[PDB]
């Protein structure tokens, strides 16, 4: 069980920029090292081996690096297509390890989220069960945090979120954030709030409706 | 050159089994070392194992000793692999590789779940109300309680793409998937444009269209 430990786990980079990627091994692995790059719905590609040999076909950008245990794939110049998922691999020893994998983003300016809050339906109410929906539209960076208030009272553990892949065209994120209450619940509060705090935000934004009609 | 086949998606009972297979062509089937490695969402590949076709001898991580057994059919040159008493944690995507290579499988993805198929039930996220806040508005539409995946969803047939943003689903602790699907669109629109949300479910052989409009306290 040689662990290959991988930092970071996430970073975002600009074209014409250089990424430095870090696997520290549990062991002494030698050069016995590979570098794989893999894409959503793909499987990996092989970019280096024996810690600094670049495999046929793969750009001169990519370079590797290390002997021991602290080895570094670094990519020079960025292009746009280097974005990815990116992991090292030891096969000095048996059983093979990976490390857990870098996911290069492409920076862009700070965008604030556009928030919006949906109250559950009429139909599915009908069914005992209420989905109240946060949709945080368009923002950059990534990190984001959405917490759910019911009559003011902060809700734990009720809730799943969804994220969308940078956009194509404008490299922002999308997010929704379902909370899943039981009807009886929902008709008890009056209250339902969406409190959003990005990077973007000056202060919290907060959307809020009260159940009536 | 080297091409390495496996199947697609696999969708098994927990406590059941499954064989994976890995097809190659393009090199002597009986040289080389086939491995084996599983891939779960964020969470690091593993190494399973390695077989020689040509002995069939074989070589196994000790974390899947007992719950991985590879094998080949060397007439076929097909590699095989088989996964025994699954539980969740055995849902991921499997691959077949060598050592450290550029030749991989495209994946099998397996699904363990004693969940039933199930089309969706398609509920309006029903744009805001009153006047608007930024002269935009955002509608779009929950699609949950449906298995196994996939969804598909469209807007007004295609006709609207600009501002669609439809979300991963997720495994909610039912056992049911959802996932929402939204378009952010002019509020000066919505008392001249239509918003209608075609979902899909293959696995199901259901589709329904919804339209999705503003709530009105006189409307029943």
């Known amino acids: 069980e040689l662990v290959m430990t991988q930092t970071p786990k996430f970073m975002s980079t600009s074209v014409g920029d250089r990424v430095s990627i870090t696997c520290k091994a549990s062991?002494?692995?030698?050069?016995?090292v590979a570098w794989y790059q893999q894409k959503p719905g793909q499987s990996p590609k092989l970019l280096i081996y024996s810690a600094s040999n670049r495999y046929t076909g793969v750009p001169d950008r990519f370079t590797g690096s290390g002997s021991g245990t602290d080895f570094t794939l670094t990519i020079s110049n960025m292009q746009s297509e280097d974005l990815a998922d990116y992991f090292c691999?030891?096969?000095?020893?048996?059983?093979?390890?990976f490390g857990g994998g870098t996911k290069v983003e492409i920076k862009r300016t700070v965008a604030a989220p556009s928030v919006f809050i949906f109250p559950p339906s009429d139909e599915q109410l009908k069914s005992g069960t209420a989905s109240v929906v946060c949709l945080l539209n368009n923002f950059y960076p990534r990190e984001a945090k959405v917490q759910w208030k019911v009559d003011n009272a902060l809700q734990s553990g009720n809730s799943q979120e969804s994220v969308t892949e940078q956009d194509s065209k404008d490299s922002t994120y999308s997010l929704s954030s379902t909370l899943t209450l039981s009807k009886a619940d929902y008709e008890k509060h009056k209250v339902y709030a969406c409190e959003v705090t990005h990077q973007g935000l000056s202060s919290p934004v907060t959307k809020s409706f009260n159940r009536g009609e | 050159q080297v091409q390495l086949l496996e199947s697609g998606a696999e969708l098994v009972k927990p406590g059941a089994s499954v064989k994976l297979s890995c097809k190659a062509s393009?090199?002597?089937?009986?040289?080389?070392?086939m491995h084996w490695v599983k891939q779960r969402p964020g969470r690091g590949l593993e190494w399973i194992g390695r077989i020689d076709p040509n002995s069939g001898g074989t070589k196994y991580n000790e974390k899947f000793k007992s719950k991985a057994t590879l094998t080949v059919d060397k007439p076929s040159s097909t590699a095989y692999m088989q996964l025994s008493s699954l539980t969740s944690e055995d849902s991921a995507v499997y691959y077949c590789?060598?050592?450290?290579?550029?030749?991989w499988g495209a994946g099998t993805t397996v699904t363990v779940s004693s969940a039933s198929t199930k089309g969706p039930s398609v509920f309006p996220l029903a744009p805001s109300s009153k006047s608007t806040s930024g002269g935009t508005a955002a509608l779009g539409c929950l699609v949950k309680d449906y298995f196994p995946e996939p969804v598909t969803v469209s807007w007004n047939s295609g006709a609207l793409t600009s501002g669609v943003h439809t979300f991963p689903a997720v495994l909610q602790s039912s056992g049911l998937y959802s996932l929402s699907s939204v378009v952010t669109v002019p509020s000066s629109s919505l008392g001249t444009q239509t918003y209608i949300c075609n979902v899909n479910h293959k696995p199901s052989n259901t589709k329904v269209d919804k339209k999705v409009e503003p709530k009105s306290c006189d409307k029943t």
């Open positions: 393009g090199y002597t089937f009986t040289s080389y070392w």
């Open positions: 691999q030891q096969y000095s020893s048996y059983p093979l390890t």
């Open positions: 590789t060598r050592r450290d290579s550029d030749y």
């Open positions: 062991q002494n692995v030698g050069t016995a």
